[PDB]
Structure formats: C-alpha cells, structure tokens
C-alpha cells in the first residue's frame, strides 16, 4: 500500500530532523543553547511517537493488502511495532522522557566526583518506571526480557546468560596465559599531533572508500554514527594526542556502522524494515570493520607505508610490531578502552546488574557495591571510586536497560559472520590488497540488503547457517591472540 | 493567556528544527543529501504553517484576555497574522512552495550560462501565483503592496517610490563629483591567507563581544545569520583570498543581525512579537554595524594595530589610508559587491522591476531587457550577459517579491538611527575606544527590546521622533564621502 508507505515516510522526516538536532548538539551547538535544544528534541520526538502510535496508522496497517513478499514483511513488522507501542500510556512516555533528561544532566555533574547520591533518586525512579514499562509491554520468562527485546528482538536473557558464561570461562583461561608474559614497550605511547592524526583518519576513510558525498567526519566528545537522512550518514571521532589508536579505531568503528546504514536498500528508507536488524547486528558491523578487519595484520600490511609516511617518528617499527601493538591486552577499569579479549567481561558485569535491577532482585542503592564486587570477580580489579566504577557509562543514566548485552552479541555475531565470509573469500589477500568492495558486497548481499525484514536469530541462520553461539568467537580469539602473543592459546 | 503562549512556543520548536535544517544545509550537509533535506524542510515548514493557521489557534486568539500591555500587543499582532494567513488555501501554499524549490534548483544550473530560457517558464509561473496570492491577501493602492507588506508591514510602494527618487537624484550628483577624481591604488588588492583572515574575523568578533556561548561562526557560499533557537544565533562569512574586506565586512554585517536577534527579550521568544520589527529594521542593524560603525575612521583607529600585526604586509599604510580603502566607490554589475553610495541604485532597479511584474505591467519575458535598460539608465553600465545581469540574485528565483526594497530602507533607517544616537553619545570616542556596550544598550533600549510589538513606521518615530525619510542618509553620505574623497559633497 503506497498510502502506508507515505505515512511512514512522512514520520521519518521528523525523525530526520530529530537526528540532525542530536548530531548538531554533539558537534557544533553553542553551550548555552543546550536546554532549549533539549526541549526542541523532546517535542519533535514526542510528536513522531504520537504519529507512530496513532489510530490512522493502525487503520492503514489493518487495511493494507500486501502485493509482494517485501510488502508482507513491512506490514508484519509494522504491525508488531505498532501494537507494542500503542499500549504505552503517553503519561508513561513523557514521565520516562523527562526523568531521563534530568538523570542525564545530573549525571554529568555528579560523575567527576563519583557522587552516587546526587544521581541515586532519579536512577531508582527510572528503574521503577522501566519495570512498569516492562510489565505493560508483557514478557516471557523475565521482566528484563521485555526491555532486552527492544534492542535485540527475540533474544532472551537466559540464552544471553548461557552464551556469556561460556564466553567468560574461555576469557579467564586466555587472560591467564597472556598475563604471564612480560609486556613489550608500546610503540604508540607517544605524542602525534592532531593534524597528523586527522590526515591519517581522512586517508583511512578514503582507503576504505567512505562515501563523502553521503556523509562527513567531525569530532565529538564520544564517537558515534548518526544516520540523519537519505544519503546523509555522519560519523564522529576523537583525537587523543598521545594515543593515535583512539582516533584510528573510532573512525573505523563508525565507518562500520555508516556502511550498514548506507547499504540498506533505498526503497526501504523511512519504513519499519528500513533500519538495521538489531543493535547486536549493527554493532557486529562496526566491530567487523574496527577489529576483524582493522586490527588484522592483513589490514596493517596495506596501511603501513602510508602510516609510516604520515608518522615518520614510527618508521623504526615493523608492520608486525605495529600490528601487535594495536592488539595489547590489559585489564582496565574503563569499558570503552578495553581490548577485544577483556571487553566482554565488562558487558557481562553490566548484564548481570541491569537484569537484576529490572527483575527487582537488586536495588539501585546496592549498585556501587555490586559493580565493585563484580569488577573484582571477573576482572580482578579493585574499583577505587564511582567515576571509574558504575558511573562511567551514560546508558543507565539515560534510562537504557537491555542495551549493554548487544555490545557483546555484536562481538559474537562479528566472529561468526567472519567465519562464514572466510569460506567464500581469501580474506587476508583481499584485505592486504585494499580491495574492500569484495567484502562490502558480501555484507550487502548477506546482511545490509535485509534491513529489518528478519529477526536477528533468523538473520544469523540465513547468513551463516547456524544460530548465534560463542564457538566462532573462541576460534577467532584463540587463533588471533596465539599469533599476537606467540604462545599456544 | 499562558495557553496562547504555549501554543506559539510549541510551534516555534518546529521553526527551530527548520532553522537548523537550513543552517546545516548551507554549511555541513553532504552533497547528495540535498534533495531529501529539501523534502524534510518542506514537510516541517508546511506542518508549522498548518499549526499557525489552525482553528485551535484562532480559538485561542479569540478567547485570550490580555492582562498587561504586552499581552495586548501579542494578541493584536497574533490576530493580524492569523487572519491574514488563514485565507491561504493550502493548495496555493504547496503550489508556490514546490514551484519555488524547482525555480531555485533550475536557477543554479542556468545561471553560469545566463540561460534565461531554462528558468523563464517557472519564473512566469511563480509571478502568476504571486499575483493571485496578492489578490487573496487584499491590498490598498497596488497589488504589489500586499507582498511588500509581508517584509515591511505598513509600508506602501508609493512612499518607497518617493523616497527612492530623492535618494537616486542625490546619488547621481554625488557619483559625478566622485568619478572626476583619479583613484588611488587599492591597498587591500593583495593575497592574504585564509588562516590570517580567520584569525582577524575571530579577533573582530571578540572585540565586538559576539557571545560565543550563544552562537558561532562558520563559512558558507553566501554569508547569513540564522537565529536557530533560544541562545543559538549563528553567523557565516566567506573568505576571499585577494579581498580580506569581504570576510571582514560580511562577519560584521552578520554580527549586526545576530545582536538584534539575541537582544530581543527572552520572554518574547517563540511569540509573534518575538522577531525583528521588519526586514528593513533587521537590515538597518546589520548595516549600522557593518558600515556606520565598521567603515568609520573611528572604528579603524581601534582595530588598526591589531590588523597590522595580523597582516604585517600592510604595515606601510596609515589608518587613514586603510579607512578610505574600505570606502572605495565604484559602479559595478554586482549588488552584493556595491559600495554604500551606489548600492541603493541596485535596489531601485529591482524595486521598479518586481513592482511592475506583480502589478502585471511587465512580463517575465521582458525582464532581461528591462534590467539591462535600467542598469544603463541608473548605473551607466552595459550589461553583457544575464549572469552579471538579472540572474545574479536568488530572490526572484525563490519567489520572494517585496523583499528587495527593504535592503534600501535598511540603509535609510540606519542613517536616521545613527543621527539620533549621535545626540546622546560621543560616537567617535566610544567607537575608537572599543566601548560598544554603550551603543548596544542604546540599540537594545530603543529598538531590540521592542521586538515586533510595533509596526516600523511607529517604531522609527518612537526611536527618532520622525517618520523615515532620506535626509539622514543624505547628511550621512555628504559628510562621510566628503571626508573620504577630500572634496566638497
Ligand atoms: Co558502535
Ligand atoms: Co543582511
């Protein structure tokens, strides 16, 4: 039904405006403009929501007569989203929405001082609303499964728990072998001017063939990807003078997200089937490019001579030394700084906590002690204060629960996708040659072209023939880190 | 009525989004994003219009009971705007809106080739709609008076004609005395790197105390000022390597607009009384700062040492030489490049043409010949082609008629405002000292604080005690250009 399509395409225009408003907020917006910008965003978002849970859309959904298979998926997906969100009493939406912004802005102030008490009351409030929200969305097995479903449709906390446990056991085994070894000096531990870093990030984006007719690179406090409109998908990075790896891998990570957004069929734009399949799947794409491609020796062989030219200071290092040095493993307090071996331990910890929070088995008051205890259990670290501890990430302070686990699933999806890719393609030759269109074409045909037509579990089977599990990841880490650290396992 | 205020403040949020969408379009937007951005903008604009011509607002306007004098003005102004635009059949709005964008985009292509025929059909169409638009808005004296009223409320074409004639006569007299003199070499006719130009524009903005917590400077193809939101008023400039005066005076011109927007009372934000009084009044503010302040010897005395430091190449010039050189008079094809003596001749020519167009006394087909004839009559120039001729400006190709004359009125207002300011203030001492808050305070108390509470004719009397006329301008030009060129008159 053309009429159904138009209704969605009209609402998407308001989403586009909201997306630009968010992008500008993080990049160019003047300081004092913040509070009003927040009000504009809230207004536009709430209007878009009204439109998307309105009777006229339900009426269109119930009257449309699909002609093709794609039309069927559209209504199917359209219906499921509509009836789920119809159930949301506009009171609860606005009550969460304002509580979020207020928790968000309070967190900014309290975080440098690890002052949990300044954010505690709003956090225990947002968790309460979430639990009510979860009740009136309905759930199988666990209240938490309701919220998890919003980010990873069809995924259950019990399966996540089973995969996480196996993943954890393998990671402690690996960590223990790696930790025995003396570390080498870090060749990237040195000052490289921002201008040189920008030059290299821009070179990388051209080498990867980022479409600068349909996006751009800017800086923000926290690197992200923002699909603003048709042919407008923007990415940000951050330049840390004494660790060029931050800008390099942020840029490539965001390229990964951007490529996904740009490669979804144009005809899907603005439609319910027009986004990525899930947060896990979107993160599988950023991680694929950032880590599987970006931290591979094959990738480095191709960028080495250009890097060396731009950064003559590091001429004295071999490509193999540089490759190993972007793969340094280290238990650290900060999730966003974690290597691909320790990273998932950070997600497990957050998974355990937010699940118990939403299932009413843990209080907000006990969060700091619980966080610290789990960092001690899984990462063997003594969290000194809350800044490095439980207030380090914004997610919870924006009210997002069920989001965190999808970062880990993203790592798992990426490894399994990569194992499949390797059956059809000489990955090392392709990547060291810089011939990425071969890889892009595989990802488009297998993944990007499907948009949100399928739930992730179905999508992973279509792509790889198997449900998601940890074996691909285990194999990926065993093989790679054995080569990195020159030891068995 | 708080309820009336809220309704407007809600619509203003959509205006805010539209404003950001326009700003980004001109600054950061990737090339291929254009067509969809145009669709988002159109959608949001049309929704905002619906809201502002909707029965619920009429009902609020007719039921509100003003408590204070400001409330009265609000409803008064609110009513006049509402009933005027209610009369607009949504067909006519969208029909003009799309015709505009299509005329706009065609013009871009045809302009480099002066191909009038590629734009002719859409232009004759947009003029026809305009004439219908003018009929169903209603008018006194002239159909053109309807459109003129949208940019300069209460102004009639007959008064504009009378002022323009006197202004023209004085200008040819002045031009003739100036043209007899041999020109000196132009000290600014040299390459100055963009980095140095940026440094100076940023210095200027700090010297003028642009509030960078509530705005920012960027570049675009065509310098402008965009009030995006509360505490968010942005300006753009353009750097021409071989004429630093372009960036200097663009920056200061836009500062002038920005200051006006920022100084309207916060309580008026989002309300009908919350904008500038008219286009003429807004342009009087940009011109005041750009020319009356910016091209004065007094201003130059204060910026001289800083300029000289930034541009050591021009150390060999005296401040008086630099001052004269930003005041070089020259008949030229291009309106945006015209000095303050010849500039208004460009506006007269456009006034005469669009008035006759809208009053049905001139066809679109005859525009090129008419333009060329009037450039010959008033500026003594032989227009070689349409690129330098009638297709040089975008206004008509965006459907804006009645806009052009307000540029000239802006010059007239500025001179009269300046004559009044001089009765209360030692302008030269204040300006050469860099003590601009004295001037800002006068402009705020007299002008900016009034927003759109008053029609321009009433506002100019309040500010200066007289209706608008050309005498202040005549006096301003006689006195200044006599000093610049060292001759009588
Ligand atoms: Co990501
Ligand atoms: Co202006």
């Amino acid at each position: 039904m053309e009429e159904l399509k138009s209704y969605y395409k009209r609402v998407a225009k308001y989403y586009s405006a909201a997306a630009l408003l968010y992008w500008d907020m993080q990049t160019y917006m003047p300081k004092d403009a913040g509070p009003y910008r927040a009000e504009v965003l809230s207004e536009i978002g709430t209007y878009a929501f009204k439109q998307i849970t309105d009777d006229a859309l339900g009426k269109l959904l119930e009257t449309a007569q699909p002609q093709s298979e794609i039309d069927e998926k559209l209504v199917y997906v359209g219906k499921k989203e509509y009836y789920k969100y119809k159930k949301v009493p506009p009171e609860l939406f606005q009550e969460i929405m304002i509580t979020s912004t207020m928790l968000e802005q309070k967190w900014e102030i309290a975080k440098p001082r690890g002052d949990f008490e300044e954010v505690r009351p709003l956090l225990e409030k947002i968790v309460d609303l979430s639990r009510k929200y979860a009740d009136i969305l309905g759930y199988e097995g666990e209240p938490y499964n309701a919220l998890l479903d919003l980010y990873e449709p069809g995924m259950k906390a019990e399966e996540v728990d089973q995969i996480f446990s196996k993943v954890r056991d393998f990671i402690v085994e690996v960590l223990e072998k790696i930790e025995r070894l003396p570390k080498s000096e870090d060749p990237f531990n040195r000052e490289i001017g921002v201008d040189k870093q920008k030059e290299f990030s821009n070179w990388l984006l051209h080498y990867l063939k980022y479409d600068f007719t349909k996006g751009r690179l800017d800086v923000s406090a926290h690197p992200f990807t923002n699909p603003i409109g048709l042919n407008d998908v923007r990415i940000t990075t951050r330049y840390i003078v004494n660790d060029i790896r931050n800008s390099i891998y942020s840029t490539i990570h965001e390229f990964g997200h951007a490529l996904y957004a740009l490669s979804i069929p144009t005809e899907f734009y603005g439609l319910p089937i027009g986004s990525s399949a899930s947060y896990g799947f979107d993160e599988s794409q950023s991680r694929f490019w950032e880590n599987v491609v970006g931290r591979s020796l094959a990738f480095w062989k191709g960028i080495y001579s250009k890097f060396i030219e731009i950064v003559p200071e590091m001429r004295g290092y071999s490509v193999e030394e540089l490759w190993r040095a972007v793969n340094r493993v280290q238990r650290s307090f900060i999730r966003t700084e974690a290597d691909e071996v320790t990273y998932n331990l950070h997600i497990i910890i957050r998974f355990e906590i937010e699940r118990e929070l939403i299932n009413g088995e843990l209080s907000v008051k006990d969060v700091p002690d619980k966080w610290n205890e789990l960092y001690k259990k899984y990462l063997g670290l003594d969290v000194p204060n809350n800044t490095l501890g439980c207030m380090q990430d914004p997610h919870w302070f924006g009210g997002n629960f069920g989001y965190f686990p999808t970062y880990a699933l993203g790592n798992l999806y990426a490894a399994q996708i990569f194992e499949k890719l390797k059956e059809e393609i000489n990955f090392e030759e392709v990547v060291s040659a810089g011939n990425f269109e071969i890889i892009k074409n595989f990802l488009k045909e297998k993944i990007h072209s499907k948009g949100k037509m399928y739930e992730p579990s179905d999508l992973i089977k279509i792509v790889t023939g198997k449900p998601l599990s940890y074996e691909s990841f285990v194999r990926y880490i065993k093989d790679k880190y054995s080569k990195v650290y020159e030891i068995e396992l």
Side-chain angles (χ1 to χ4, degrees), chain A:
Chain A
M1 182 83 97
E2 302 309 329
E3 191 177 335
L4 183 66
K5 290 183 174 177
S6 298
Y7 189 105
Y8 277 123
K9 286 179 293 166
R10 184 188 93 89
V11 186
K13 292 167 179 141
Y14 296 81
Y15 284 136
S16 180
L20 180 64
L21 286 158
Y22 182 77
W23 175 87
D24 172 79
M25 185 204 303
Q26 295 302 309
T27 54
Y28 291 104
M29 191 190 63
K31 177 136 109 301
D32 293 2
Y36 185 73
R37 170 63 49 86
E39 287 169 51
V40 178
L41 249 189
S42 189
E43 168 61 35
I44 281 190
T46 306
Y47 176 70
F49 186 79
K50 277 187 179 47
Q51 296 300 298
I52 220 70
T53 55
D54 184 83
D55 286 344
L57 169 58
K59 181 180 185 181
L60 279 166
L61 279 176
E62 280 289 338
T63 188
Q65 292 116 291
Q67 313 299 310
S68 56
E69 149 126 76
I70 278 163
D71 288 344
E72 171 259 311
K73 289 295 179 181
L74 175 62
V75 183
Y76 182 75
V77 176
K79 284 201 178 185
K80 268 160 71 177
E81 304 215 3
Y82 175 84
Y83 291 114
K84 181 163 58 166
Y85 290 117
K86 193 75 168 181
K87 308 188 290 193
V88 176
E91 180 268 351
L92 199 50
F93 179 81
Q94 217 77 123
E95 170 72 337
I96 291 168
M97 243 212 177
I98 71 159
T99 302
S100 168
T101 288
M102 276 186 290
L103 184 46
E104 151 77 274
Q105 282 298 94
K106 222 159 199 170
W107 171 67
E108 313 259 36
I109 280 67
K111 175 187 167 176
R113 282 173 301 102
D115 201 323
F116 197 59
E117 297 294 55
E118 292 180 55
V119 296
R120 174 188 177 179
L122 295 189
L123 181 57
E124 52 199 2
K125 181 185 178 181
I126 204 62
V127 170
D128 188 52
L129 300 183
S130 295
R131 298 177 62 180
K132 291 327 165 192
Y133 186 27
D135 273 340
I136 75 178
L137 283 164
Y139 54 82
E140 310 171 25
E142 274 175 75
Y144 178 73
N145 280 345
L147 301 183
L148 180 59
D149 189 74
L150 304 174
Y151 300 91
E152 200 71 18
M155 181 63 73
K156 304 290 183 43
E158 188 166 284
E159 175 149 75
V160 168
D161 190 89
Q162 295 171 24
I163 313 188
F164 281 7
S165 296
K166 282 292 168 297
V167 160
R168 187 244 173 162
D169 292 343
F170 164 72
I171 297 172
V172 322
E173 163 221 294
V174 161
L175 259 184
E176 178 145 1
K177 292 166 192 168
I178 289 178
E179 254 144 36
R180 304 168 193 168
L181 285 40
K183 296 176 190 292
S184 53
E185 255 130 294
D186 186 348
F188 291 97
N189 175 59
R190 74 182 64 237
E191 57 166 356
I192 298 166
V194 181
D195 290 347
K196 290 183 180 180
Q197 294 196 31
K198 281 173 176 152
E199 181 180 15
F200 192 55
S201 258
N202 281 293
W203 186 87
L204 281 169
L205 287 165
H206 281 110
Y207 183 62
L208 287 167
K209 296 189 162 83
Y210 187 54
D211 192 352
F212 283 102
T213 69
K214 302 185 179 56
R216 49 173 301 107
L217 171 71
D218 289 279
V219 304
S220 68
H222 309 274
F224 66 94
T225 288
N226 193 328
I228 286 152
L230 197 48
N231 296 350
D232 192 5
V233 175
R234 300 183 198 186
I235 55 177
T236 63
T237 190
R238 177 182 170 227
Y239 299 103
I240 301 189
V241 161
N242 294 281
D243 193 7
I244 195 173
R245 298 168 283 222
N246 196 88
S247 72
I248 294 170
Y249 291 103
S250 279
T251 297
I252 300 169
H253 184 97
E254 305 309 335
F255 166 84
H257 286 309
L259 182 59
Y260 193 169
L262 288 166
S263 300
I264 290 168
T266 319
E267 44 272 54
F268 298 1
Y269 188 85
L271 301 181
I273 61 176
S275 37
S276 44
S278 65
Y279 282 63
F281 256 89
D282 191 22
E283 187 72 356
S284 86
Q285 298 305 283
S286 56
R287 294 303 206 171
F288 175 80
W289 289 99
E290 182 205 357
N291 294 340
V292 175
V293 180
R295 295 178 199 271
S296 74
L297 175 55
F299 183 71
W300 265 95
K301 286 183 177 166
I303 68 174
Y304 177 78
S305 59
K306 195 71 201 182
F307 175 81
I308 282 316
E309 164 185 2
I310 292 174
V311 193
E313 306 87 304
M314 298 183 58
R315 175 77 152 168
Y317 292 102
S318 72
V319 58
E320 289 86 11
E321 282 166 327
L322 295 188
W323 164 65
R324 292 188 152 98
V326 305
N327 290 296
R328 299 174 62 91
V329 171
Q330 193 187 57
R331 288 172 298 101
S332 62
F333 288 120
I334 309 301
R335 174 187 59 85
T336 55
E337 303 175 356
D339 60 275
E340 64 188 334
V341 177
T342 62
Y343 184 93
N344 298 311
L345 297 181
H346 292 267
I347 300 301
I348 291 155
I349 292 162
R350 293 156 173 67
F351 173 58
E352 281 193 26
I353 295 169
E354 64 175 38
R355 185 189 196 179
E356 291 163 13
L357 280 184
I358 300 300
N359 292 345
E361 313 174 347
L362 179 78
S363 63
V364 161
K365 182 180 187 293
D366 281 3
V367 163
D369 290 334
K370 191 60 173 181
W371 186 280
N372 302 343
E373 182 218 319
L374 299 169
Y375 265 78
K376 179 75 169 161
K377 184 190 182 63
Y378 298 121
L379 283 158
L381 303 182
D382 293 287
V383 174
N385 61 73
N386 298 321
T387 312
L388 301 169
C390 67
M391 303 175 64
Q392 70 172 253
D393 280 312
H395 300 62
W396 290 347
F397 305 95
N400 312 72
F401 306 99
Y403 193 158
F404 277 131
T406 75
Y407 289 116
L409 296 182
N411 292 313
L412 302 182
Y413 285 125
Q416 201 167 316
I417 292 165
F418 175 53
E419 279 200 339
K420 180 64 193 160
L421 168 68
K422 282 206 284 191
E423 308 183 347
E424 312 185 345
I425 268 144
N426 189 337
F427 178 89
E428 212 127 350
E429 188 165 33
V430 171
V431 171
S432 56
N435 190 14
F436 306 112
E437 183 49 48
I438 293 177
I439 288 176
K440 297 178 176 188
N441 181 69
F442 171 95
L443 302 164
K444 177 166 61 181
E445 289 178 340
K446 299 297 189 281
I447 308 180
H448 307 156
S449 59
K450 305 303 161 43
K452 208 183 212 300
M453 285 198 296
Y454 304 87
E455 299 196 30
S457 61
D458 292 342
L459 187 51
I460 196 66
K461 286 178 75 66
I462 290 164
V463 170
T464 68
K466 301 169 283 165
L468 175 67
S469 57
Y470 55 88
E471 284 85 349
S472 300
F473 177 78
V474 164
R475 280 185 297 263
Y476 169 82
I477 295 290
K478 279 205 192 172
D479 168 87
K480 174 175 179 183
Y481 285 87
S482 161
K483 300 186 215 295
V484 171
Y485 285 104
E486 300 204 73
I487 56 163
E488 179 164 8
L489 258 54

